[PDB]
């Protein structure tokens, strides 16, 4: 069947890393079929990297306070958790923080090894007073979604290891809603609004693209059961739908040198499509050839951007 009204997706930017996408007009229903799916795929189906556990020093589990630092263990763990990192190593990778003396120990004082990066060096991790020392170790690894310290507790016991919650997913908060939008035609056509908020690393548009790709793969998994199965046909794919105005037009050219147009008219070319592809060999072999005529059929041929030997659409002439 034919949808008869292709939905469109439009983005709005609220902050540096906060966006609001609108999809409309969706058929009756269909605002809930792909709203929860998009939200969950965004929040749990994008790879990321994060800290798994920390080793503050040789002495800990004195949760009252870590000597030398103003804050307490829980605040330090939360500050570490706010850290955003990117990694390429499948195995866990250990980096060190070795700030000393009084002052404010921040993320820029970390010493990541090769293959990992910290995207917000300006984050503050703690404050040291009275010439204190903070010799900390951070283990970073990759994953998906939110996995708590539970499922990260290690049966093997180490004196200084403390596991922390891991926020792998780049997107931090996603919400969605649906509304009625149609007036001209019948009402009950759904408009879907999704608000996405991520972290410093990735922009919302990339997250949306990745989620869409993953869902497309997931549902192609089921569409493969019987490829010759009818569904709801969107129809006019925007790219070729727009490019049909200039790529497959029967008129070879509108404004160009009359000499070249006349030469190429009575030589086996009627629509620009027959010329766009396989251009060099056709222009060379046959009697119709030109040296500088290329300038008239290569540069000025691109009415809205086109190169030759390009695959032409509509290979069947609508005679």
């Amino acid at each position: 069947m034919l949808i008869a009204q292709r939905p469109s997706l439009t983005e709005e930017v609220v902050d540096e890393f906060r966006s609001r996408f609108v999809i409309e007009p969706l058929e009756p229903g269909f605002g809930y079929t792909l709203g929860n799916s998009l939200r969950r795929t965004l929040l749990s189906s994008i790879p990321g990297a994060a800290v798994t556990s920390i080793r503050i020093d040789g002495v800990l589990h004195e949760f009252t306070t870590v000597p030398g630092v103003k804050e307490d263990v829980t605040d330090l763990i939360l500050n570490i958790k706010q850290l955003v990192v990117s990694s390429e190593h499948d195995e866990p990778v250990v980096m060190y923080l070795r700030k000393q003396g009084p002052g404010l120990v921040t993320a820029a004082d970390i010493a990541p090894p090769a293959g990992v990066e910290v995207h917000n060096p300006d984050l503050v991790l703690a404050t040291l007073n009275g010439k204190g020392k903070l010799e900390m170790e951070l283990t970073v690894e990759r994953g998906r979604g939110y996995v708590s310290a539970v499922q990260n507790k290690q049966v093997g016991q180490e004196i200084g290891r403390i596991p922390v919650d891991s926020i792998y997913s780049p997107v931090l908060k996603v919400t969605y809603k649906v509304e009625a939008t149609r007036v001209e035609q019948r009402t009950d056509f759904d408009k879907l609004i999704v608000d996405v908020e991520t972290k410093q690393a990735m922009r919302p548009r990339d997250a949306m693209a990745s989620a869409g790709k993953t869902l497309v793969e997931l549902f192609g998994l089921a569409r493969e059961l019987n490829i010759d199965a009818e569904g709801i046909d969107m129809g006019p794919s925007p790219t070729d739908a727009a490019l049909a105005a200039d790529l497959a037009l029967p008129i070879e050219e509108l404004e160009l040198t009359v000499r070249s147009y006349n030469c190429l008219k009575r030589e086996g070319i009627h629509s620009v499509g027959e010329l766009v592809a396989r251009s060099e060999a056709d222009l060379l072999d046959i009697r119709n050839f030109g040296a500088k005529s290329i300038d008239e059929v290569k540069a000025k041929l691109a009415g809205m951007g086109l190169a030759l030997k390009d695959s032409p659409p509509g290979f069947d002439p609508t005679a």
Binding site: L43, T74, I77, L78, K81, Q82, Y146, S148, V150, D165, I167, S169, L172, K173, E197
Partner: protein, 48 residues
């Protein structure tokens, strides 16, 4: 009606509820929501 009930069930203590968590510290409300979506936290459990 059906709004007082919702805002009460939302904001109430876990007397006889299956309160899970009860000691976890979260860096923001978004992290708490992420922990709740997974079967790890209860809407009434006391957390930091």
């Amino acid at each position: 009606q059906d709004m007082v009930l919702g805002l009460f069930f939302l904001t109430t203590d876990g007397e006889l509820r299956d309160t899970k968590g009860e000691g976890r510290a979260f860096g923001s409300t978004a992290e708490a929501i992420m922990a709740f979506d997974a079967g790890e936290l209860a809407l009434q459990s006391q957390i930091d």
